[PDB]
Design a protein around this nucleic acid. Structure first.
Lengths: 48, 146, 76, 128, 71, 191, 126, 100, 208
RNA sequence: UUCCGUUAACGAACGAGACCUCAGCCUGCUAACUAGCUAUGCGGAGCCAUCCCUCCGCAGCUAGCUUCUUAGAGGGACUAUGGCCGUUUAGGCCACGGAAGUUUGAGGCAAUAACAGGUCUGUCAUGCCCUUAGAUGUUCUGGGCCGCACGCGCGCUACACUGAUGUAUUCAACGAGUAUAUAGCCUUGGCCGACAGGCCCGGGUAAUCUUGGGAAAUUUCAUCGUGAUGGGGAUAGAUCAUUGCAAUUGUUGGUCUUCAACGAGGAAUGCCUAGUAAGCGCGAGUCAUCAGCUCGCGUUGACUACGUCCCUGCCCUUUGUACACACCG
RNA sequence: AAAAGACUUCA
């Protein structure tokens, strides 16, 4: 029913359907801007 | 000169120490090359028919001097210092270095001689006999430096 | 060093003789012939040689004064 | 001149192991209490409380060695659609603060976990 | 450039002097201590700024009346 | 004491004949002058005195830049060190004196700045406050030295050295002295 | 015994100096100082204060300056040597000050922001 | 250095070609003309006579032979006391007339 | 570094769950081997409701997704210690007027009509443009102070979002509040803090 | 709109300044073998051969040690002081102290309101419209963006001897190692390979191990000799490895061979005012593989101005306006 | 100071 497969390469997140994407945050780096505003990374707490 | 023998190993200018020390290595029974050389041993130019004045004895001498002070240093430490092997812009290319076989082979000859022993994870270690060989020769070197 | 042809004689034209490190006149002569090999088999590399456009995937976005002919005014 | 036969030999205690005795002779001390918090003020406060516990126990152990900064530091203009200026500087500093004790008794272990002053400080009783 | 007094500094400097005056001095170092007693200022540089400005004013007062300071 | 400046040359042996030039070439610093590599806030005050001077320090820094690309302070010190001994042995006189002589000769009185005003471009000349004279003389010397080096077997230290002696003699063989009188000629005439 | 370290500071990189006032050696990294930096005007910076001073045998300096390039190395050692002897002698107060010491700069490498090709030198267009 | 021409479409600009070769040297040094008399009497002695000490590199330009030609010659002469050579990192040195 | 990634994933759990969510906020403190996970809502009663099934559905799911140990966890009801500071209800209440309608402008005013009531000192409510389905031209309303951006870190800023889907046009929102500091006293308005003493016949005098 | 003062206006709020972040100065404060330095021994090396001297170990111990490192909490600058100038004020200029006199230096916040700026291709945010089994869904296979007679921008590399080549010197900083499967993500060490690379062990989800981040510029001893030069490294062909099932319009790297234009760039035009210009490397990001890129970081480091508004953009007055679609009027 | 001119519709 299915055919032939082979097609490893750049995985891709759930959050972005985009070739480039992040392991760190589970985001994209445009999605990341939202998270940057939120802080979200430990030892970081806004307003820089 | 006799008083000088211990201290001089350190306090002398390294470049001219290597030039002096290399002559002493000509005396040694080793200096075995076994035909590893032929394809292109080193950077560009220095495939090793020119090696007898230019390259070989000074290569051996530099390794010998360094191991004394810096002791516990293995093959990978030697490769980088003599080498460049920095990432090119792809437009640059200049030389392409080697050094992995080269360092291994010379260090092996020194081990046969009894200069070097192998720390099991710490790299190559200078022996007591190796230190004696370095320091005794260095006595003679002091005269021209000073 | 040496340099010696090998493989079953079956294949008609060329082979490569094993990266010519014989050198002097012989390598220079073979250099011209090597382009003809690619043309003869009818590889895309040979089609590119035939056209006069440089083969080995350079940018061509601009630059092509080298690539097939010199700087001639406009375009198309 | 000469003559040294060495090991450690004059008896025990190192900066690695805070030697103590009883408990079938205690040769077990090496606990690391590692404090990872969002806010530095809370993190520092936690360390002070740990020092108090050590003093109470039997033997007061050494104070914090607060170690290093770890940075994931991001400037990306998220998109303009052709923007090459005016990015935004959100940088993450993070510190891991390590307090060793002179004696990690069974008593020390239980008190540290049960009353733990961390609100957003996560401080870990942790492996050899 | 740089070193002009702000409105926040101007209001505070007059007020401290007015109702602390006998204790206040021409001396910079002691009047730094006074600002700890009279207010909490969060950073170091704020304390030094106010202390310096007030002492300059204290000199002027003891050499002729100052426009907005009455003791 | 055995004061340095390459540990071969004194600098209080330099007598600066032009009195006005002497005051703006400081040959003595707070303990005495020397050449050692350092750093130095020289600001950008004008009119009046505006910096302390070491002749060698000014020389090395100008060489590092002008005659473009590559160079370093350490590289520039190296060529200067070589050049000074060459000059010293060719004049049989302290080489610091020779450069001071060169600077005063090769320092024009007046300039020929490009200012466009109304319907024409006038050069009426503008100031050349004396540190600017020092820099300008060396700059002209450097471009001359560079030209020779490019297509001929001569090290830049030697190229510079020859011109320096020539400039300190009014000899138009030097690039710098030739250009000094070029600027003045146009500036004065077209007033 | 005798080993007193007075921290100068001035440019990146820090020299921890155990100094004993005695015999006239200069060392850094357990090797003689002018030979270490041979053929350099910057070696003479270090040598400046054990020449100009009139004092030779007054410092056996052992110096270790650790971890960043060979170029930096000279400067720090000079300053420490002045200060150590200054504690003893009240006449060599005018020796530390007047032979010039102490600039950290306070402008030690600045931040790189976007738009910069290097950090402060903006791109060739934009 | 001189500037350049200008571009054209096809073209590229150069403008300068150099002074051009003379002083091939080392070949000439080995053969008898320069090995015997010519270098010692004509070239080597006379430039230091004019100005008592002269650097090698200035003299190279005047005589119009390369440096390496006299590299060997300077060593032979210096032993005699005819020349005084020095040192330098960039290998610069002197030709000197007489000691005394 | 790796620990920082782990922390970020824990925060992500709150973001997904408390996306839409018609209650109000969730601070979380993590005690040994259990998560306290505290809901800070008026209608914290409905979401729990005790025993049932409801409470177990909330917990279990989160654990299998992301945390450690086949065990239970904890869930706590809380009041609100000023509804200003942080919420989710603050945005949702405005949405619950942009249902059945009433003037959009009037609804904006009503949110502010609260907030200042519970202290605040300044408030800015800002409601998405496109009144009468025209082009966007966002409308303010503000009384007092209010610093989202400018002055110090510790302004205590409420911020949210939401959307209201009409036939013709979206009406966004972003309720914003600059309130007090954490109720216990620790007030510090706008970073430099002036203060005097009372009156100078001294031998006693000191204050702050 | 920083302030004083005149003062039909008084007193506020917003922006900015302030603040926040980050770089400075402290054998101060508090600590630390998961960071160091000393002191002490020193098994260990060398020399006087003899104590000693000198070197050596991220342990040989100790420390009453914290200078660096690390990070918490402080104080430190307020143009202090003195003198000039000024309504004798707000101030500005200089001298001295001082680490710093300059909003402390450098960044971040940077508004009300405006723009039919840009993004429906960040998002199961979304109105409306279409489409929707012969899909504009989705999945699979293959190709594209790489196409080139030529215009433009960001860039890269040069024209050389302040340089290339070849030995030689041999020293880091900001960061980061996701279970990734049978050691796999970073990889030291040992073999083997000229290279690229392979292989076997081991440590490390990390102040520890990788990493003294032993990096490049630079630095030194030769070669060269001013030559389209061996500078430059183009285009091309063969061959071998690495990643991927697969490498082609050569993914990338190397080897062999080819040995370009370029001899300092015009009309024009950008950026820059002492840790900045220029040269120089690196890590992180995208990532199976691919960086001439970006974003930070170290390193080497100025000539010239510290003035003015000519050029240029905008702000406050007065003045003009037939403009308001606002001079592209 | 004389080198400065044009410039679609809904608007």
């Amino acid at each position: 029913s299915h055919p032939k497969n082979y097609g490893a390469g750049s995985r891709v997140c759930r959050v972005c359907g985009n070739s480039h994407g992040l392991i760190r945050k589970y985001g994209l780096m445009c999605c990341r801007q939202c998270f940057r505003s939120d802080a979200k990374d430990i030892g970081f707490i806004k307003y820089r | 000169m006799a008083d000088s023998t211990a201290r001089t190993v350190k306090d002398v200018n390294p470049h001219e120490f290597v030039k002096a020390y290399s002559a002493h290595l000509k005396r040694s029974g080793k200096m075995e090359l076994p035909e590893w050389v032929d394809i292109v041993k080193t950077a560009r130019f220095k495939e090793l028919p020119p090696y007898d004045p230019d390259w070989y004895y000074t290569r051996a001498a530099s390794i010998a001097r360094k191991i004394y002070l810096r002791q516990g240093i293995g093959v990978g430490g030697f490769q980088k210092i003599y080498g460049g092997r920095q990432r090119n812009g792809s437009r640059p290319p200049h030389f392409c270095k080697s050094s992995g076989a080269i360092s291994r082979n010379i260090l092996q000859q020194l081990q046969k001689m009894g200069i070097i022993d192998v720390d099991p994870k710490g790299g190559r270690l200078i022996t007591s006999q190796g230190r004696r060989d370095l320091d005794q020769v260095a006595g003679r070197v002091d005269v021209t430096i000073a | 060093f040496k340099v010696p042809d090998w493989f079953l004689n079956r294949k008609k034209d060329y082979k490569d003789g094993r990266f010519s490190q014989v050198v002097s006149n012989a390598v220079d002569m073979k250099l011209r012939d090597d382009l003809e090999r690619l043309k003869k088999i009818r590889n895309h590399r040979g089609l590119r040689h035939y056209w006069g456009v440089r083969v080995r995937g350079q940018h061509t976005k601009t630059t092509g004064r080298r690539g097939k002919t010199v700087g001639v005014s406009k375009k198309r | 001149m000469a003559a040294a036969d060495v090991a450690y030999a004059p008896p025990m205690k190192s900066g690695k192991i805070g030697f103590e005795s009883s408990q079938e002779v205690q040769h077990r001390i090496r606990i690391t209490l590692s404090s990872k918090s969002v806010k530095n003020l809370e993190k520092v406060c936690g360390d002070l409380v740990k020092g108090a516990k050590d003093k109470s126990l039997k033997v007061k152990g050494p104070v914090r060695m607060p170690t290093k900064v770890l940075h994931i530091t991001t400037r990306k203009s998220p998109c303009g659609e052709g923007t090459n200026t005016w990015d935004r500087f959100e940088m993450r500093v993070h510190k891991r603060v390590i307090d060793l004790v002179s004696s990690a008794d069974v008593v020390k272990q239980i008190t540290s976990i049960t009353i733990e002053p961390g609100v957003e400080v996560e401080v870990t009783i942790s492996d050899q | 450039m740089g070193r002009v007094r702000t409105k926040t500094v101007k209001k505070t400097s007059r007020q401290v002097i007015e109702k602390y005056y006998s204790r206040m001095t021409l001396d910079f170092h002691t009047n730094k201590k006074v600002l700890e007693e009279v207010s909490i200022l969060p950073s170091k540089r704020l304390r030094n700024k106010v202390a310096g400005f007030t002492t300059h004013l204290m000199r002027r007062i003891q050499r002729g009346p100052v426009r907005g300071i009455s003791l | 004491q055995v004061v340095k400046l390459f540990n071969c040359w004194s600098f209080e042996d330099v007598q600066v004949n032009d009195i006005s030039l002497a005051d703006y070439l400081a040959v003595s610093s707070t303990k005495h002058a020397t050449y050692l590599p350092h750093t130095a806030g020289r600001y950008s005050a004008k009119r009046f005195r505006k910096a302390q001077c070491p002749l060698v320090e000014r020389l090395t820094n100008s060489l590092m830049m002008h005659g473009r690309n590559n160079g370093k302070k350490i590289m520039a010190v190296r060529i200067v060190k070589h050049a000074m001994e060459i000059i010293h042995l060719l004049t049989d006189a302290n080489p610091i004196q020779v450069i001071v002589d060169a600077i005063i000769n090769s320092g024009p009185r007046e300039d020929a700045t490009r200012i466009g005003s109304a319907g024409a471009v006038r050069r009426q000349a503008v100031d050349i406050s004396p540190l600017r004279r020092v820099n300008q003389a060396i700059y002209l010397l450097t471009t001359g030295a560079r030209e020779s080096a490019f297509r001929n077997i001569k090290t830049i230290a030697e190229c510079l050295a020859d011109e320096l002696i020539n400039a300190a003699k009014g000899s138009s063989n030097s690039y710098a002295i030739k250009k000094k009188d070029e600027i003045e000629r146009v500036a004065k005439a077209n007033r | 015994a005798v080993s007193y370290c007075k921290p100068g500071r001035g440019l990146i990189k820090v020299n921890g100096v155990p100094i004993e006032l005695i015999r006239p050696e200069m060392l850094r990294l357990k090797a003689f100082e002018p030979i270490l930096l041979a053929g350099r005007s910057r070696f003479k910076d270090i040598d400046m204060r054990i020449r100009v001073r009139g004092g030779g045998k007054t410092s056996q300096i052992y110096a270790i300056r650790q971890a960043i390039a060979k170029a930096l190395v000279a400067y720090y050692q000079k300053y420490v040597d002045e200060a150590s002897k200054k504690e003893v002698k009240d006449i060599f107060a005018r020796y530390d000050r007047t032979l010039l010491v102490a600039d950290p700069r306070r402008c030690e490498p600045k931040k790189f922001g976007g738009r910069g090709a290097r950090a402060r030198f903006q791109k060739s267009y934009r | 250095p001189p500037p350049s021409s200008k571009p054209a479409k096809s073209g590229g600009g150069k403008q300068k070609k150099k002074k051009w070769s003379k002083g091939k040297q080392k070949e000439k040094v080995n053969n008898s003309v320069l090995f015997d008399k010519a270098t010692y009497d004509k070239l080597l002695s006379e430039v230091p006579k004019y100005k008592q000490i002269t650097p090698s590199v200035l003299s190279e330009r005047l005589r119009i032979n390369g440096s390496l030609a006299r590299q060997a010659i300077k060593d032979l002469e210096s032993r005699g006391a005819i020349r005084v050579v020095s040192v330098h990192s960039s290998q610069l040195i002197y030709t000197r007339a007489t000691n005394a | 570094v790796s620990d920082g990634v782990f922390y970020a994933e824990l925060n992500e759990m709150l973001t997904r769950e408390l996306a839409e969510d018609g209650y109000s906020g969730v601070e979380v403190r993590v005690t040994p081997m259990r998560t306290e996970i505290i809901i800070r809502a008026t209608r914290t009663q409905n979401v729990l409701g005790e025993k049932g099934r409801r409470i177990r559905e909330l917990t279990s799911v989160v654990q299998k997704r992301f945390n450690f140990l086949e065990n239970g966890v904890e869930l706590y009801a809380e009041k609100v210690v000023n509804r200003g500071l942080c919420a989710i209800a603050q945005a949702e209440s405005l949405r619950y007027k942009l249902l059945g309608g009433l003037a959009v402008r009037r609804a904006c005013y009503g949110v502010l009509r609260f907030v200042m009531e519970s202290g605040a000192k300044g408030c800015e409510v800002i409601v998405s443009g496109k009144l009468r389905a025209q082009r966007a031209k966002s409308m303010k309303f503000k009384d007092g102070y209010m610093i989202s951006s400018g002055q110090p870190v510790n302004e205590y800023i409420d911020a949210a979002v939401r959307h209201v889907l009409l036939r013709q046009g979206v009406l966004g929102i972003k309720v914003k509040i600059m309130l007090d500091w954490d109720p216990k006293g620790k007030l510090g308005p706008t970073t430099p803090l002036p203060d005097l003493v009372t009156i100078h016949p001294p031998k006693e005098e000191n204050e702050l």
